[model samples]
Target: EAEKCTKPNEQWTKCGGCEGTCAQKIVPCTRECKPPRCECIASAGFVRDAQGNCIKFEDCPK
Candidate 1:
């Protein structure tokens, strides 16, 4: 099963002991069982914008 995020570039793909790609990023798992939760953590230098999109780190203030 796969869950597509309402916002662009955000999505979750079920992994059946196989590599899966979410948001153009590759996720590799060694376990045979499905992960409890697959979440995307924005890079420390970036932040989620108002529209739920990733923006440059500079766009966000400390």
Candidate 2:
């Protein structure tokens, strides 16, 4: 059976590849294929927080 992603704004897909994070603002991907995993949706304009949840830039801790 396939695993599930319970985090908000997260989805299970083939390439949970490059995504922004509060710690690492920019990310670059080589377009390589990866196993399915949970990742934040780029279209959501959110990045991964310390807790592994997606949050907007303004919401990041100072």
Candidate 3:
């Protein structure tokens, strides 16, 4: 049998969430697994950091 190569989503586990919402809030991942860093963009709302973690804006310090 030949080895199979799949897309990121196809191989990686699936996490559910709404677009333009906080990735952490929408996704149902544990806090430990949540991405350690994230960015809040006007266009994308909230996104996971390089580690694939997202944090809510309210939890962030001003």
Candidate 4:
């Protein structure tokens, strides 16, 4: 089986918010557990970093 990501994402570390590990997850972004959040919802604008974080903006056609 492939590796799994529960909470907090890092570069082979598993930490995104503040810690290198996770105790509890407020919001999960994966379809395995609670379900991963869509990057673009109802047409959105944003870019994701290596840790799966939004760190940019893009123009949305009107």
Best by lDDT: 2
* Cα lDDT, model 1, residue 3: 52
Per-residue error for 30 in candidate 4, Å, reads: 15
Candidate 4 lDDT at 6 equals 44
Candidate 3 regions with alpha-carbon error over 4 angstroms: 1-44, 56-62
Error of 1 at 31 (Å): 16
Q: Per-residue lDDT for 1-62 in model 3, tens only?
A: 32323422211222233223333424433533323222333233444444544434443434
What lDDT score goes with residue 12 in model 2? 65
* Candidates, ranked, TM-score: 2, 1, 4, 3
Residues 1-62 of candidate 1 have per-residue lDDT tens digits of 56556754333535422332223233444567456334333422334554555544455435
Error of 2 at 7 (Å): 4.3
Candidate 4 global lDDT: 0.30
Q: 2-61 in candidate 2: lDDT tens per residue?
A: 466776567765676667787666577787746678766554567878887777877888
lDDT of 3 at 14: 24
Compute the lDDT of residue 32 as modeled in candidate 4: 34
Ranking by lDDT: 2, 1, 3, 4
Which number leads on TM-score? 2
| TM-score, cand. 2 | 0.51
- Higher-ranked by lDDT: 2 or 4: 2
25: Cα error in model 2, Å: 5.2
Per-candidate total of colliding backbone pairs: 0, 0, 1, 2
What is the TM-score of candidate 4? 0.21
